[model samples]
Target chain A: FVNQHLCGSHLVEALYLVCGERGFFYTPKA
Target chain B: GIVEQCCTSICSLYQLENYCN
Candidate 1:
């Protein structure tokens, strides 16, 4: 779903948003 | 690259991040 790498910045940013900068499923930002 | 469509810079970051899981 990304033009760049599958788990690149875009992907990391995605996860970092809804899930923060961790591996949690439903967490909030700091 | 830039996200001029987000409501804010923080929101933009949220959008970009949500792209993954």
Candidate 2:
């Protein structure tokens, strides 16, 4: 469960994420 | 590579989008 602050006033999230991709790379983090 | 969207731009991809809102 998650609550995020963006365009809307309040938000809730439920994600089913599995990262196994190979060609992914990160340049920077905000 | 992560690109974040704020307003009308995708900072990393250098894309510009204009909204009607």
Candidate 3:
């Protein structure tokens, strides 16, 4: 399972999209 | 480009989570 450590930013963004904004957020651009 | 591929996998999270449940 790819928790916070085993995952990618792409996956995180997708998580925000598929799951819910309440549970995730967009990665900051820097 | 990225969204398209993720769509191919349906965010795999969807598949993985549903499968696990």
Candidate 4:
């Protein structure tokens, strides 16, 4: 089964890994 | 690549436009 992407402290990390540097955002409102 | 968020409280830090890939 495909685990629901361990979304603990590594969720953002994993996103960055696959989606690259611009995948995640810190100030998503600015 | 890594992005970190360490805010004292929950707030919208950046105002981004809408676009989907």
Best by lDDT: 3
lDDT of 3 by residue, B1-21 (tens): 223334333334544233221
* DockQ winner between candidates 1 and 2: 2
DockQ of each: 0.08, 0.10, 0.05, 0.07
Alpha-carbon RMSD, each predicted model: 9.9, 11.4, 10.5, 9.3
lDDT of 2 at B17: 16
* DockQ, structure candidate 4: 0.07
TM-score of each: 0.27, 0.19, 0.32, 0.31
What ranges in model 1 sit over 4 Å off?
Answer: A1-7, A21-30, B1-21
Which pairs clash in the backbone of model 4?
A27-B14, A29-B14, A29-B15, A30-B14, A30-B15
Ranking by TM-score: 3, 4, 1, 2
The positional error of residue A29 in candidate 2, measured at the CA in angstroms, is 7.0
lDDT of 1 by residue, A1-30 (tens): 323332335544555555554453322232
Task: Tell me which residue pairs clash in candidate 1.
Answer: A13-B17, A14-B17, A14-B18
Q: Report lDDT (Cα) of residue B20, candidate 3.
A: 26
lDDT of 4 by residue, B1-21 (tens): 112222222212131111111
- List per-model TM-scores for chain B: 0.27, 0.09, 0.24, 0.18
> Alpha-carbon error at B15 in model 1, in Å?
15
Candidate 4 lDDT tens digits, A1-30: 112322335443444454454555533243
* TM-score, model 2, chain B versus true chain B: 0.09
Which 10-residue window in model 1 chain A sums to the lowest lDDT? A21-30
Predicted candidate 2 versus true structure: per-residue lDDT over A1-30, tens digit per residue: 122221212110111111122222232233
Off by over 4 Å in 2: A1-23, B1-21
Best by DockQ: 2
